[model samples]
Target: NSNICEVCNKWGRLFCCDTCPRSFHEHCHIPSVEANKNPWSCIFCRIKTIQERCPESQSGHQESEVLMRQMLPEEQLKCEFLLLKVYCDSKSCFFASEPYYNREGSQGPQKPMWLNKVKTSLNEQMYTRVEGFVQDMRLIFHNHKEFYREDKFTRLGIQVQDIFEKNFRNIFAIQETS
Candidate 1:
């Protein structure tokens, strides 16, 4: 069965997340997943107890616009954490590699987006707005879903995209219309 660690892809004492299929060794995970009790969740599967608040002044208009504006200090940190979270996902980490794939006659996207690229952009502080960072993250998976289509790769991208979306909302404390 799936007794292997998703990170090292090797067998050993593994801790499984209650909310996710990913398994990891005590030393393999970023936050070092420790399972003391049943139903333990990994960092990726755990939800933030503190809810992020976006004042109405920033939320009244278009949500995209809000995201498009200058990133608040919280957002900057959140985006950094979000990227780290994505990198922690073993499969998604593939997108962080160089020479993403062999290209021959338009095999991949023309303007390919990858985690490395985003990482560089973030490190350089190229993204002034939250939307800029979010857009790049979306593009990375969007390209996969578009090119892979009904494939496991696509499935991987979708799942990662779900993670990004959920974390983005929660980390930013995006409010729903009442």
Candidate 2:
């Protein structure tokens, strides 16, 4: 009775709770039969656990907040550059953002589906360019198998489908392909 577990009241390697009389074998703890920790609590007591047990876990978030609140001039510039990066990268998702962007000065068309035309147009153009690029690469490799060279091309067209969907999905949209 004295060495018996206070929880299951069964005979086993009973370890008394550091904070309370409740005893369970290391395994009897909630996590596992073999689990044990210092300054532990029984499942029923359920003392501070997980995130509550660690004060340092929030430091990364705090650091970001403080950094955001007080950036020097160069840091602010970096922040602006990040916005540009997102905007530029987003363009990769669209077909040909260039002319569509240019035509925006009809002072912005009232006809809603107009943007879709531009996207499809760009998609057509890109299809041709990508086709040529693939063919040229194929020819180079096939014709001269021993002359293999490193390919550093920034295959940005790979994301053309994604970009088209992002920019033109809202428009009634495409008719230009083919």
Candidate 3:
């Protein structure tokens, strides 16, 4: 399902963290004194702590594959969409959240409009089914479709196409590859 370790970007036994947005291989993580924390965050998320605590040498940091398969199909889709929100939020190795808006005007607060689309899709009614979620995201994509012609709709269309790919393994809902 998933391609490889986020650290090395090569194939291995990927360990997806419950606390953070990225995944890792068992060997990819730094040696930690305690393993008591179950939902460990990936190293990328820990870099701040690494600096904060080691304060000097400090540093560092899921379920989709097997866990996703164990769930009911509809639940799997829900989890899949939830993970996408997580994935699209934090700066993943491959992409960053699409920043196309300024809530207050110039130089005020800025956030990704697509993330708002995520918030829009997550309203109480969207989870009834995959179709409902898809339709709503489609509605979002369409509402902003022609704004720039290539920027909004095209990129979203590419993202939407990913859901249809075989054995799609997202951060929270890792699909079974084997």
Tell me the whole-model lDDT of each prediction, alpha carbons only.
0.69, 0.35, 0.42
| TM-score against native, each model | 0.60, 0.23, 0.31
Q: Put the candidates in TM-score order, highest first.
A: 1, 3, 2
Comparing 2 and 3 by lDDT, which wins? 3
lDDT per residue (tens digit) for residues 1-178 in model 1: 2588866678899888777787878755644465476878665554332222324323434457558768665556557667767766677765776535554433677778887788777767789898899988998888887777666657888888988877666555566665
Candidate with the larger lDDT of 1 and 2: 1
Question: What is candidate 1's local distance difference test score?
Answer: 0.69
Per-residue C-alpha lDDT of model 2 across residues 4-55, encoded as one tens digit per residue: 6653457777776665666666543433333546776554344223225554
What clash pairs does model 1 have?
A: none
Largest lDDT belongs to which candidate? 1
Q: Candidate 1: where are CA atoms >4 Å away?
A: 1-62, 99-106
lDDT value, residue 144 of candidate 2: 25
Clashing pairs in 2: 27-33, 27-34, 93-163, 94-163
Candidate 1 lDDT at 140 equals 86
Best by TM-score: 1
lDDT of 3 by residue, 18-129 (tens): 6665665654443211256786765445444434544422111123223323344434334344434334322222222354433332341122245344444444334544
